């Protein structure tokens, strides 16, 4: 059951794909690889076909390719990007060179939505709900996205949302304890991101649009107050604690003064997401039970994920061993039902 492939050259890139993928139109390149928009004649969907660039040129890249394929193959949730297909033209491991990934082609991200209409409070509830729904699932497999932001959130005409682009304007949504490497971060780094996204959808302004890391950190600390003793004790870097102790202390602001005219339940949830100490931020699963989502919360329709074995991260392997493991993941892929 190996498909028929056809080979063509678009840009300076060669594409060898099964003939089910028609009218390949290049949509750009980068470190993530070349991407073409295409038509999937088997499912009738428009898809993105992503060809990885140099997936096995180093130990580092070969392991990175394996990590990506394992992760994408595990994500099965209606609010998270899923893998429609993965393929190689190679008929054997010894021919194995190229990896292609296929996803549903996403027609608009959250920024494109905001540029075409004014969102209602109900739109915001549903968008944020779906982010938190997806995160509960991601976090339940001990995955941290690390890079939530509006450009990584796809939205369709029915206002249905999907989390895209798992990690490994760029800093504005990032938690302060990883923007400056204060500590080993938990998954509530993503909850901070959701807070920044939510505040921006409500006010129409970026919450913390700092230029450099320091300028940004001061805007954050102006809203949420400077770290107290309990948080300082959790910061590993002696230099970080010394920098923090040099700052003039600042109390937390009253958010109702910052977000005047927003649904008080929305403001209340933001207060629970944008807490400086990550150990006290609301989790995705708790946040779904917040009164703000009462129209959408359904405890029996907020699934968790299967356990995700990441013990490969501590394996020290040869470049061709990472390449062989990736090949197994390619040949063992089962497509989703439809």
């Amino acid at each position: 059951e190996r498909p028929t492939f056809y080979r063509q050259e678009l840009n300076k890139t060669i594409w060898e794909v099964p003939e089910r993928y028609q009218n390949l139109s290049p949509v750009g390149s980068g470190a993530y690889g070349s991407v073409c928009a295409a038509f999937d004649t088997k499912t009738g969907l428009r898809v993105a076909v992503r060809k990885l660039s140099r997936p096995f040129q180093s130990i580092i890249h070969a392991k990175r390719t394996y990590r990506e394929l394992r992760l994408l193959k595990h994500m099965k949730h209606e609010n998270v990007i899923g893998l429609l297909d993965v393929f190689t033209p190679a008929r054997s491991l010894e021919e194995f060179n190229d990896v292609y990934l296929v996803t549903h082609l996403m027609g608009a991200d959250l920024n494109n939505i905001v540029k075409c209409q004014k969102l209602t409070d109900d739109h915001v509830q549903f968008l944020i709900y779906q982010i938190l729904r997806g995160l509960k699932y991601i976090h339940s497999a001990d995955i941290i996205h690390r890079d939530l932001k509006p450009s990584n959130l796809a939205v369709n005409e029915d206002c249905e949302l999907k989390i895209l682009d798992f990690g490994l304007a760029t800093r504005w949504y990032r938690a302060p304890e990883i923007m400056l490497n204060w500590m080993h971060y938990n998954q509530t780094v993503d909850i901070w991101s959701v807070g920044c996204i939510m505040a921006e959808l409500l006010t129409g302004r970026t919450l913390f649009p700092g230029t450099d890391h320091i300028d940004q950190l001061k805007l954050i600390l102006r809203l949420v107050g400077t770290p107290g003793a309990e948080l300082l004790k959790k910061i590993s870097s002696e230099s970080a604690r010394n920098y923090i102790q040099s700052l003039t202390q600042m109390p937390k602001m009253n958010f109702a003064n910052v977000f005047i005219g927003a649904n008080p339940l929305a403001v209340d949830l933001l207060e629970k997401m944008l807490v400086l100490d990550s150990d006290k931020r609301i989790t995705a699963a708790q946040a779904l039970a917040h009164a703000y989502f009462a129209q959408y919360h359904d405890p029996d329709d907020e699934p968790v994920a299967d356990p995700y074995d990441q013990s490969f991260e501590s394996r020290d392997l040869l470049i061709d061993e990472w390449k062989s493991l990736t090949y197994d993941e390619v040949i063992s892929f089962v497509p989703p039902p439809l």
């Binding site: 494109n112 939505i113 540029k115 075409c116 739109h123 939205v155 005409e157 029915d158 249905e160």
Partner: peptide, 8 residues
């Protein structure tokens, strides 16, 4: 969500 969001 019933009425259609606008797409660019």
């Amino acid at each position: 969500r019933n009425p259609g969001l606008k797409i660019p």
